[PDB]
Design a protein around this motif. Sequence first.
Motif, PDB file in Angstrom:
ATOM      1  N   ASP A 258      -6.214  12.039  11.786  1.00  0.00           N
ATOM      2  CA  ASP A 258      -6.893  10.768  12.005  1.00  0.00           C
ATOM      3  C   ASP A 258      -7.612  10.251  10.753  1.00  0.00           C
ATOM      4  O   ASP A 258      -7.389   9.117  10.327  1.00  0.00           O
ATOM      5  N   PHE A 259      -8.465  11.089  10.167  1.00  0.00           N
ATOM      6  CA  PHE A 259      -9.352  10.667   9.080  1.00  0.00           C
ATOM      7  C   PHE A 259      -8.754  10.793   7.674  1.00  0.00           C
ATOM      8  O   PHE A 259      -9.299  10.241   6.716  1.00  0.00           O
TER       9      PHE A 259
ATOM     10  N   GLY B  23     -12.008   5.277   4.339  1.00  0.00           N
ATOM     11  CA  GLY B  23     -12.229   6.663   3.966  1.00  0.00           C
ATOM     12  C   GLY B  23     -11.130   7.371   3.187  1.00  0.00           C
ATOM     13  O   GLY B  23     -11.390   8.393   2.562  1.00  0.00           O
TER      14      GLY B  23
ATOM     15  N   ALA C 110       0.819  -1.210   0.000  1.00  0.00           N
ATOM     16  CA  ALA C 110       0.000   0.000   0.000  1.00  0.00           C
ATOM     17  C   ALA C 110       0.854   1.262   0.000  1.00  0.00           C
ATOM     18  O   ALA C 110       0.547   2.233  -0.691  1.00  0.00           O
TER      19      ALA C 110
ATOM     20  N   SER D 133     -16.822   3.593   2.017  1.00  0.00           N
ATOM     21  CA  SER D 133     -16.397   3.402   3.396  1.00  0.00           C
ATOM     22  C   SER D 133     -15.662   4.650   3.863  1.00  0.00           C
ATOM     23  O   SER D 133     -14.480   4.825   3.579  1.00  0.00           O
ATOM     24  N   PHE D 134     -16.372   5.507   4.589  1.00  0.00           N
ATOM     25  CA  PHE D 134     -15.777   6.578   5.375  1.00  0.00           C
ATOM     26  C   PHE D 134     -16.650   6.686   6.617  1.00  0.00           C
ATOM     27  O   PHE D 134     -17.840   6.964   6.495  1.00  0.00           O
TER      28      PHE D 134
ATOM     29  N   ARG E 293       1.723   6.886   2.763  1.00  0.00           N
ATOM     30  CA  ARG E 293       0.473   6.132   2.816  1.00  0.00           C
ATOM     31  C   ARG E 293       0.045   5.694   1.423  1.00  0.00           C
ATOM     32  O   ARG E 293      -0.802   4.814   1.269  1.00  0.00           O
ATOM     33  N   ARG E 294       0.666   6.293   0.413  1.00  0.00           N
ATOM     34  CA  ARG E 294       0.306   6.040  -0.973  1.00  0.00           C
ATOM     35  C   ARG E 294       1.459   6.354  -1.898  1.00  0.00           C
ATOM     36  O   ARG E 294       2.285   7.216  -1.600  1.00  0.00           O
TER      37      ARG E 294
ATOM     38  N   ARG F 108      -8.968   6.198   0.775  1.00  0.00           N
ATOM     39  CA  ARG F 108      -8.649   5.749  -0.566  1.00  0.00           C
ATOM     40  C   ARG F 108      -9.821   5.031  -1.187  1.00  0.00           C
ATOM     41  O   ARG F 108     -10.495   4.245  -0.523  1.00  0.00           O
TER      42      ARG F 108
ATOM     43  N   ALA G 272      -9.202  12.588  -2.783  1.00  0.00           N
ATOM     44  CA  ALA G 272      -8.354  11.478  -2.364  1.00  0.00           C
ATOM     45  C   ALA G 272      -9.125  10.450  -1.544  1.00  0.00           C
ATOM     46  O   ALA G 272      -8.791   9.265  -1.545  1.00  0.00           O
ATOM     47  N   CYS G 273     -10.163  10.907  -0.853  1.00  0.00           N
ATOM     48  CA  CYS G 273     -10.872  10.069   0.103  1.00  0.00           C
ATOM     49  C   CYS G 273     -11.944   9.200  -0.540  1.00  0.00           C
ATOM     50  O   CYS G 273     -12.703   9.659  -1.395  1.00  0.00           O
ATOM     51  N   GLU G 274     -11.995   7.940  -0.123  1.00  0.00           N
ATOM     52  CA  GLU G 274     -13.128   7.088  -0.442  1.00  0.00           C
ATOM     53  C   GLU G 274     -14.321   7.575   0.359  1.00  0.00           C
ATOM     54  O   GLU G 274     -14.165   8.235   1.387  1.00  0.00           O
TER      55      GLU G 274
END
Lengths: 577, 577
Positions: free
Chosen positions: B229-230, A239, A51, B56-57, B240-241, A241, B51-53
């Motif tokens: 956090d989120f 949330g 990841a 699922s968030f 993270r990516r 990705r 960037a955020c899904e």
Amino acid sequence: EFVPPPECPVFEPSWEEFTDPLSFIGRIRPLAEKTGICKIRPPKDWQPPFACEVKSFRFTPRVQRLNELEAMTRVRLDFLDQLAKFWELQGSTLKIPVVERKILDLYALSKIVASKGGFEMVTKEKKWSKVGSRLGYLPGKGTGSLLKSHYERILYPYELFQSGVSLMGVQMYTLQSFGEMADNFKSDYFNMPVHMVPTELVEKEFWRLVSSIEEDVIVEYGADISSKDFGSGFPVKDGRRKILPEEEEYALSGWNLNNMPVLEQSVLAHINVDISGMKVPWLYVGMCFSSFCWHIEDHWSYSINYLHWGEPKTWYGVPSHAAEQLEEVMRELAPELFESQPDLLHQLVTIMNPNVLMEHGVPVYRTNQCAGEFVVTFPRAYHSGFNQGYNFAEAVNFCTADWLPIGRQCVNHYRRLRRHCVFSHEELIFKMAADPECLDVGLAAMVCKELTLMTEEETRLRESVVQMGVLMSEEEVFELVPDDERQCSACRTTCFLSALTCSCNPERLVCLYHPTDLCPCPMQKKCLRYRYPLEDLPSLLYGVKVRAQSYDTWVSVMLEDAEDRKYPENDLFRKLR
Amino acid sequence: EFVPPPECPVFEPSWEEFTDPLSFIGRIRPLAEKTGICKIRPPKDWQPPFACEVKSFRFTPRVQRLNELEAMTRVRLDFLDQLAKFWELQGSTLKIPVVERKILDLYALSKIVASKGGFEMVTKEKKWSKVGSRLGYLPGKGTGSLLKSHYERILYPYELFQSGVSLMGVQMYTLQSFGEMADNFKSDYFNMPVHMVPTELVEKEFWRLVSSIEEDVIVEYGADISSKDFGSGFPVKDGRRKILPEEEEYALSGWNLNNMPVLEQSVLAHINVDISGMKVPWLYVGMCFSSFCWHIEDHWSYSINYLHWGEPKTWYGVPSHAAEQLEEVMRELAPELFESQPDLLHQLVTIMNPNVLMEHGVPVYRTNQCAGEFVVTFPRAYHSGFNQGYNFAEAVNFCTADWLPIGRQCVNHYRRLRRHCVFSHEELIFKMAADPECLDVGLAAMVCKELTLMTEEETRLRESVVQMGVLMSEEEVFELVPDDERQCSACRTTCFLSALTCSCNPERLVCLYHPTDLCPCPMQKKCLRYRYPLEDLPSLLYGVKVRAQSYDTWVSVMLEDAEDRKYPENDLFRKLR
Ligand SMILES: CCNC(=O)c1c(O)c2ccncc2[nH]c1=O
Ligand SMILES: CCNC(=O)c1c(O)c2ccncc2[nH]c1=O
Ligand code: NI
Ligand code: NI
Ligand SMILES: [Zn+2]
Ligand SMILES: [Zn+2]
Ligand SMILES: [Zn+2]
Ligand SMILES: [Zn+2]
């Protein structure tokens, strides 16, 4: 000269065995438990994408000097034994302060401070910061003036004494750039390509460097890293990705380490209670020779370790049943010292050459963890090891039904030491008992056996204390008060079921295992602060015994109730279809 | 019936203007500063991916009842106005506690406790948890038994008093699933498609509902959500990516709210000092009618808000020059009360209809923030607003050269109230002064102008205290001590440059503006704990005056030294090429 130990067993499960990890590990427990560690090979088809980026992944490296990496050296042991006896004579007692999450090295500290001419020398010259630097402490956090305060309060009296006569007054990086670093280091060392040097050879040279004073060798690693802050090397859905369909499978795989804690066979599962500090994986980046000293896991239990990529990780395991025996030999080194400081044994980091443990009759196994392969650590299985080269891994802890009694037995040992507990084991049990349904039946069964042991033991402690002459009984909710407030004056353990409070302090507490040490006020007036009245015995043992013995009868629309009550299958459900 | 105020300006910068965010704002400041807020439209080619899904968030929603959204209601004020006077009589003073990040509402609390039959009633029935629930307080955190501790200590004496006679003793959700919610709600309300309702209509309906007791309306939102956090709704590089080349553009953009704090003209730039709580953005998910009450950002600086997507967000701003005028009218409601509780004015949330502030002579502007547009908040600009419908937004605060003197002025106000400073303004200034090079020349020039004022004021405070009869002077490093410890007995301000200690307490501290309140202990012996000896004046004013007046002369190999010293361009550098 150095001798490789026996290899711990490996497993290569079928895709159907690989489905439920904690069942497969239960399958494997009776066997792997005896080696203390075991390696697992996921099906070759299972290869989750990494990841994280690398080119930007930033971490602050920690360091190791393999010479002094061993803290148990004869000279350090004998020193502390003497500084202790000094404070014993003084009527005081030697307390080792904790700094930067690790114990202070006094021998190092006392050496260094003296090397530059002593306490008031260093003081007047303000070199206290230069000290902490060489001590492996991160600036600029202000450790320097903290070491002064500590040296003065502990080492300076001994300095004077140990000095001439005297003693009158007073008293009372990038992951990318790190790989380049790591691979450059290894090749220049062995004069080969990094992948081309055999594992036996590096292993041999590693234990050579530990005891060898003829040379100094330094290395950089990283650890104390959280999926929380730094992100997981696994795909998972929160949330942040849009998850690729390629990744979708692995993200939901129970073998993805973020998913293990919540698995129905996990204890840290359906309870939404507290941060145990591991529901979340930890990351270890590595170099060649990068090591982790002998140790066990907090509250014992298990640890699962996975190597994402890079050169192999080398392990050494020991069984859970050889545990006491292990600590016993390490104790032979400074028996008088380990008496006065029981827990100091664990505080002190050690790599004790496996041959030495084996010649002393301790079982010691080992293995090479290779990229894409799991390693499992069982309750109270001592483990250590190092990395073959540049690599990256991710590890969590966890617990299961079988562990519950060990986890209880674990507190008692932490209670008998003076050891802060990362949570309340007994609190955990009730949080499970308070939601009997949707709980894996194996837990429910074990909980009945475990809980009745405590109801007995508690009622004994509860009746024991009224004789002592306390009268009032207050009622408080312990889980809502912070851990450090609910501890016991000298235990030091997090109290849940009950504890004792007198009026000598507004808040200071002692568990029922040490009622007399609360304060000199006679038992006299109160106060037993309890949690449940003893109306608990019928209540909570019911709901758990229900689902425990609901399954006992159910085995002896029937395939419906299993789905409704969420029973496990394998086995029995096969006869159905 | 409701009247829309005048629109605040919008800005549609060129790609060349759009290259540096903080320059373009200073360009704008003299203009937008007068409206207190402004809107900014990036070039239409500029469309950072999200960037955020969503699917699922997970976020825990908070809630609002628009009727009681107003805390400044007459009945609540008079209640608190009386309750203060009650306690003044008793010899005590009314102290309003904080519960879970915000002040406890006593009027609501009392009303409820009284409706179910009062203190001992509620206690003996153990309904204290039912209370906090209706007060909105999130379970199961133990707020219930916490309110009981508070009511008894404050409201029960008044309960008895206010009751018959008496008073003897004693005393002393998913973003996805949320999108479904908000769309359904908004459409069923107006009986239209959600995108089809005009902006002006919702605006009118919103303010209708506030003052309307004729009907009750409840709404859900989320906030107090950190990028930490989120995760941020912007692409960006940490570990993270791996970042897509499509995204590589927007990740590095100065208009990425992650980058803004670190930008060369930011104060929160090169200093690695302390968590300000915003170096990091924050997230507000929103609904139809979801609102945020009038307020100014902590330490009066800036807030840049970017709406990521969804239906627009309505704003109401005020200029910084009308700020003192603004607070004045809200104060007219309970002058006697606000005298005893100066900061209670800010503590209490209020949505005061713009038409009222306008008819009281306060400038009130507004605008419609649409997806992909920025909203900039200027120092001490009071602002409130509500959401038109389902949307998503991200925000950060930040500081600039022009803010520095206002930041200093803010502390003086936070000091004249009793208000906890989120950091020490003076400490900030010296951390910058300590690294003059690679520090934006505008800051440096401002710093010297700001710092000299402080050397004077401090030396005035430094010479003032010796007359009081303090002698000994210790020296301490304040930044390395935690904030809450280095505060003032009653100020309450984070002390850095200096403070006063005595032996009455091992640690209790007072800011040099308030030396008398430390203890009754006569000045007598000591103790002034200072930071710098007064050897500071020559030193630190130098390094900053260096780079300040190095640039002054440089404008008065020349194009080299600008590249070496990292001078800015625009302008002058154009004449070069
Ligand atoms: C050199 C980086 N450190 C490590 O690789 C490391 C581990 O692999 C490890 C495995 C199991 N239990 C504890 C551990 N602790 C560790 O520090
Ligand atoms: C309904 C969701 N909330 C918000 O949109 C919201 C803001 O836009 C905001 C802007 C500036 N300062 C504070 C803020 N607080 C907020 O809660
Ligand atoms: Ni371990
Ligand atoms: Ni704001
Ligand atoms: Zn105890
Ligand atoms: Zn006592
Ligand atoms: Zn004093
Ligand atoms: Zn103060």
